[PDB]
Amino acid sequence: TAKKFKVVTTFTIIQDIAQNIAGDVAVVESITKPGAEIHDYQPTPRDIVKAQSADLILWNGMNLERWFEKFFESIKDVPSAVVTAGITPLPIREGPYSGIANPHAWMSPSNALIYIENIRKALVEHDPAHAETYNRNAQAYAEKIKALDAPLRERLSRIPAEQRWLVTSEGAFSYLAKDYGFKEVYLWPINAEQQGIPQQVRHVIDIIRENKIPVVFSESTISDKPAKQVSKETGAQYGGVLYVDSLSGEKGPVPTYISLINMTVDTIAKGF
């Protein structure tokens, strides 16, 4: 038990999944902090040193971290692994990033089983001395993720199909919405400096009326003002905040990936 194998992840969701697989035999840290916007994060000098100190770096890919490839050029002799390997992307549907991969694949718990497996494989490959702890922890954690499907679907079962409209700020929920049969509407398709600020807002304001959508949400790393505006101009309640791009702090309401999925579905469900 020397100085432990060190994993650095780009953001907090991957950190929590990886730490569950690592147990107490490796130390997993995230470059971005709870609450920080992850798509256009601006790495600092202290971030370079942190990643350079790792034995393995994990990132999402599907161009989630617009900053990572240029950042990784400053890191030497540290293997990196894309934790979405083998996941089939849903494309972004509108806007300046139309046709790019929607990167938010972790919002489907069935996809999370593929995250777990890619992370297990990377740990076992680069830290073979603990292969049996990683393999044990991954199978146990995968069983915890599979056990969410029944309570999640039951939590959402009072909403008839025609009324399953999920109206959010970032279009970050496409994978969750596909899993549980929701139609998505969003104020912007992916986080970015972008045009389309008020024109989508009133296209959304329109969609709310033809379908009498009762609730609209925001997300924890972006501003709630557009969602709150859309709630006032319609008769819809502001239901947010939903969690997708970041966990909370350790003492907050969403300290783990499991708590993130559960609370997001629970908050959707109470909005209806």
What is the footprint of Zn ion within residues 117-136 (CB under 5 A)? 125
List the binding residues for Fe(2+): 39, 104, 170, 245
- Helix (H), strand (E) at residue 263: helix 257-271
Nearer to Zn ion, 16 or 159 (CB): 16
Q: Is 79 in the site for Zn ion (CB under 5 A)?
A: yes
Q: Which of 232, 241, 221 is nearest to 12 (CA)?
A: 221
Taking the least distance from each CB to Zn ion, the nearer of 191 and 220 is 191
The alpha carbon of 20 is separated from its chain's Cα centroid by a whole number of angstroms, namely 16
**3-class DSSP string for 106-168:** HHCHHHHHHHHHHHHHHHHHHCHHHHHHHHHHHHHHHHHHHCCHHHHHHHCCCCCHHHCEEEE
At CA 109, angle to CA 169 and CA 69, rounded to 5? 65
CA 212 to chain CA centroid, nearest Å? 28
Binding-site residues, in ranges, read: 39, 104, 170, 245
Among 245, 260, 268, 271, binds Zn ion (CB under 5 A): 245
- What SS3 state is found at 233? helix
Decide if residue 172 touches Zn ion (CB under 5 A). yes
Nearer to Zn ion, 159 or 219 (CB): 219
Q: Minimum distance between the CB of residue 80 and Zn ion, rounded to whole angstroms?
A: 8
Decide: is 112 part of the binding site for Zn ion (CB under 5 A).
no
Residue 241 makes contact with Zn ion by CB under 5 A:
no
Structure tokens that stand for 241 in this block = 């905040």
Minimal distance, residue 9 CB to Zn ion, in Å = 15
The pair of three-digit structure tokens given for residue 71, joined into one six-digit string: 């950042």
**Single-letter amino acid code for the residue at 125:** E
CB of 210 to Zn ion, least distance (A): 27
For Zn ion, the closer of residues 61 and 159 by Cβ is 61
Q: Which stretch binds Zn ion (CB under 5 A): 72-80, 134-142, 206-214, 249-257?
A: 72-80
CB of 140 to Zn ion, least distance (A): 23
Q: Where do contacts with Zn ion occur on this chain (CB under 5 A)? A: 79, 125, 170, 172, 191, 245
